Amino acid sequence: TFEVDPMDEPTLLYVLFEVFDVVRVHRPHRGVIETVYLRTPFSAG
Amino acid sequence: QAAITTTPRNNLNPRSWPAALVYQESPAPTTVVLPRDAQAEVQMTNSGAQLAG
Amino acid sequence: MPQWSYMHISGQDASEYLSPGLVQFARATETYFSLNNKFRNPTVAPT
Amino acid sequence: DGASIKFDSICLYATFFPMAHNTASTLEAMLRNDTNDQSFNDYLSAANML
Amino acid sequence: TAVDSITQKKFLCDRTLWRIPFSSNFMSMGALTDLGQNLLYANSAHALDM
């Protein structure tokens, strides 16, 4: 439930969290980079 | 010179030649394993993380 | 996949699920009973 | 008759095949052979003379 | 007469439907898909927000 003060204009309620998104830059080779990309709670697959 | 490497023929001038002793080149099957692993990719991409390797 | 054991879309590629002794009439005098649609063939796709 | 063509921007596009990246390099590694190559012909491969 | 007017561009489709197959490749997989064929997507499934 979200209750606020009256708004004059159609203003956005910018709702966030403290959600984690961590990336490891993997590299087994000199020349190419593996991008281990994952938003942790919001499944990328 | 007509008998040194010639390999004497059945008819002195034939029509359609076979494959024996007419130097049929066999370059050996160039064997490389895998650039990326299939078994390592299926497990991650279905459960969570996205990759580019 | 065991859930398609009844449905037979996963159980046998496309023909041998019923009694395979009635395949005679289809390939030999089929024109009267042109019947390959009553038993509808399963879909197949690699993965 | 007061007409001309103008150019502003040109781009080269391509519609690539999406697949698992294992056979994407394996199948072309078979295509990288002296005997296993590519060749193409047209219906009018015919020569012209006037 | 030369007037500095412009052309507006569109299309006309009206009888058929669009098709967007669930699989990784958009080709005709049918009922048995590829992306939703996986057991991880199947039993313990996600939702769908759009």
Side-chain angles (χ1 to χ4, degrees), chain D residues 17-35:
Chain D
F17 188 83
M19 69 195 292
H21 310 270
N22 283 246
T23 34
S25 188
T26 307
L27 297 159
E28 62 88 19
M30 314 187 107
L31 262 149
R32 76 160 204 174
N33 295 335
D34 297 295
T35 49

Side-chain angles (χ1 to χ4, degrees), chain C:
Chain C
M1 206 169 181
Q3 285 186 62
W4 311 78
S5 299
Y6 302 96
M7 279 284 102
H8 65 247
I9 313 299
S10 93
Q12 296 245 309
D13 270 342
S15 176
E16 276 168 306
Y17 190 74
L18 322 186
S19 191
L22 204 54
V23 295
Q24 210 181 299
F25 291 95
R27 289 289 168 178
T29 27
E30 75 150 54
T31 340
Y32 296 114
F33 291 95
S34 185
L35 268 45
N36 207 64
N37 61 299
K38 310 269 175 163
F39 177 88
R40 197 139 155 90
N41 48 73
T43 50
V44 279
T47 182

Side-chain angles (χ1 to χ4, degrees), chain D residues 3-49:
Chain D
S4 291
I5 312 148
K6 263 276 172 76
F7 279 77
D8 200 285
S9 188
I10 50 141
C11 313
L12 187 75
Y13 306 95
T15 88
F16 274 76
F17 188 83
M19 69 195 292
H21 310 270
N22 283 246
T23 34
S25 188
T26 307
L27 297 159
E28 62 88 19
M30 314 187 107
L31 262 149
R32 76 160 204 174
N33 295 335
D34 297 295
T35 49
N36 192 188
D37 60 293
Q38 285 187 306
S39 62
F40 204 83
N41 65 302
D42 211 302
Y43 203 88
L44 196 94
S45 288
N48 294 254
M49 210 61 71

Side-chain angles (χ1 to χ4, degrees), chain B residues 10-49:
Chain B
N10 301 52
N11 299 298
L12 287 153
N13 187 251
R15 41 179 180 180
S16 186
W17 282 81
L21 215 73
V22 287
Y23 257 91
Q24 293 298 319
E25 197 75 60
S26 184
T30 317
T31 320
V32 284
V33 192
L34 289 163
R36 292 175 193 174
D37 279 329
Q39 288 158 50
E41 279 173 52
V42 174
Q43 203 177 58
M44 272 74 257
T45 53
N46 296 325
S47 188

